[PDB]
């Protein structure tokens, strides 16, 4: 099939929790009500088997042909990862104050270059989940290799 | 010593051929003409050994303690990778015309978010090198572990 390092152009949908969270189809982007005006639509180029896409997308692409389309189910391990409890940290309120941040339950904040979701605040102790937003989530893609190019 | 998955805050300065190309130090970036107003400066949080920094940087970090600062020279294979002959692709000039790009020898173009440097344009096809700009390059870092979160 398509082997590691081959520059292919790919089309992909991709759903999480029923709703669609990512696509190269702009017509479907409007219809689902997710269309971001600052998004590069149509097929995009990648080097197959090189971490440029989710691991499970890389695998499917390696066992596909030029012009082929597949629907693929990605378990968390193959998508954005499993949720890791060690990425839930308890941070002193003062650390937020000095940075001009007012932490609020359910707020997503950037701390030291990194996004976190605020879980709770108790007694000057802020619990932050730094796991990826979609970690622990099954994603579903439809992927199509439009062309190969070497 | 730092354990894998451990959340650490780091600061660093990257040099190639004696020139600064990356830094968490805003002042130094401005002094050295590489300041990027879209970049977030100051210490940056990462998870040790989880591949969020260069392989050789991850290794140093695992070998280090909090508050510790060191200088390391990384071979291409522990930094941005060796030059990859398979990443030099012969792309048809028709693909440039339709995009409205004039290929110029030495110019850096983007195809689908992937940068490439134009090497030559012969027989109706453009040779493009899609290697990282610093592939094959030995790099020096100054790295400090500023703190451990936990």
Swiss-Prot record, chains A, B:
Residue segments, region IF: 83-134
EC code(s) of this entry: 5.2.1.8
PPIase FKBP-type domain segment(s): 5-92
UniProt key word Cytoplasm: no
Catalytic reaction equation(s): [protein]-peptidylproline (omega=180) = [protein]-peptidylproline (omega=0)
Record's keyword annotation contains Chaperone: yes
Biological processes per GO annotation: protein refolding
Keywords per UniProt: Chaperone, Isomerase, Rotamase
Subunit description: Homodimer.
Swiss-Prot/TrEMBL domain comment: Contains an N-terminal PPIase domain, an IF (Insert in the Flap) domain and a C-terminal domain (CTD). The CTD mediates dimerization. Chaperone activity requires both the IF domain and the CTD.
Free-text function comment from the UniProt entry: Catalyzes the cis-trans isomerization of peptidyl prolyl bonds and accelerates protein folding. Also exhibits chaperone-like activity.
UniProt similarity note: Belongs to the FKBP-type PPIase family.
The name this protein goes by in its record: Long-type peptidyl-prolyl cis-trans isomerase
Stretch of the intact protein here: 1 to 150 of 231
């Amino acid at each position: 099939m398509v082997e590691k390092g081959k520059m292919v152009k790919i089309s992909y949908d991709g759903y999480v929790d029923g709703k669609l969270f990512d696509t190269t189809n702009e017509e479907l982007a409007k219809k689902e009500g997710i269309y971001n005006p600052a998004m590069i639509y149509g097929p995009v180029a990648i080097f197959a088997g090189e971490g440029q896409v989710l691991p499970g997308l890389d695998e499917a692409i390696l066992e596909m042909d030029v012009g082929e389309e597949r629907e693929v189910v990605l378990p968390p391990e193959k998508a954005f990862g499993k949720r890791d409890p060690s990425k839930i940290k308890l941070i002193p309120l003062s650390e937020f104050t000095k940075r001009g941040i007012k932490p609020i339950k359910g707020l997503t904040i950037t701390i030291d270059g990194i996004p976190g979701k605020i879980v709770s605040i108790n007694s000057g102790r802020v619990l932050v989940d730094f796991n990826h937003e979609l970690a622990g989530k099954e994603v579903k893609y439809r992927i199509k290799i439009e062309e190969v190019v070497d």
